[PDB]
Design a protein around this nucleic acid. Structure first.
Length: 133
RNA sequence: GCUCGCUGGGGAUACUGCGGGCCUUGGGACCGGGAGAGGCCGGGGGUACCCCCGGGGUAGGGGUGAAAUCCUAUAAUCCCGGG
């Protein structure tokens, strides 16, 4: 690690928001180095706390502390969602992670839509009425 | 008055049938601008999924109303680049 002349590293904080868990992973600008990867499960094991927003807040906060050591001080936030036969809407940890970043002191200059939306179409599981209980 | 089904001649020509003539009002046909997810063929773009190659990166991922099966450690999820 020499040949820094940017004078302020920037990291594209990736947020994958499933209804089944929330994962928060941060990489530098390139994407070529992962500093942090923290998931809801690693925070707390209980299968319902896994997508829960409090669990997601703390996972994002942990990563955020690591990012500050690095001198990652600005973040782009890239929101996506599951998409191949799931709902394409982002889960609860999106809103939680944005809040953990806002408290954490990492300033957001862009908000980015890299979510799976096809222009070629994908069918999600149902039963001819969608999902039901 | 009767099922009242049949017959012959004379007359009329509105309406109907037929033969002839005639007219554009119906019908089909002509020409010019114009719009279109009409049909047939060829070319081509991107989004998104998937597979595989390489990098990066650990311990859970996945799934639900909750779960469980299941999936994962010479490494899955995760994140990048390429085909």
């Amino acid at each position: 690690q020499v040949n820094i002349k940017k004078k302020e590293k920037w990291g594209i904080a990736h947020i994958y928001s499933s209804f089944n868990n929330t994962i928060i992973h941060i990489t530098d600008i390139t994407g070529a180095e992962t500093i942090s990867r923290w998931s809801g499960g690693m925070v707390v094991k209980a299968d319902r706390d896994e997508p829960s927003p409090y669990a997601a807040m703390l996972a994002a906060r942990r990563a955020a502390e690591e990012a500050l050591e690095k001198g990652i001080v600005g973040v782009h936030i890239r929101v996506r969602a599951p998409g191949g036969s799931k709902s394409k809407t982002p889960g609860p940890g999106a809103q939680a992670a944005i809040r953990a970043l806002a408290r954490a002191g990492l300033k957001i200059g862009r908000v980015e839509d890299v979510t799976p939306i096809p222009h070629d179409g994908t069918r999600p599981k149902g039963g001819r009425r969608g999902r039901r209980v």
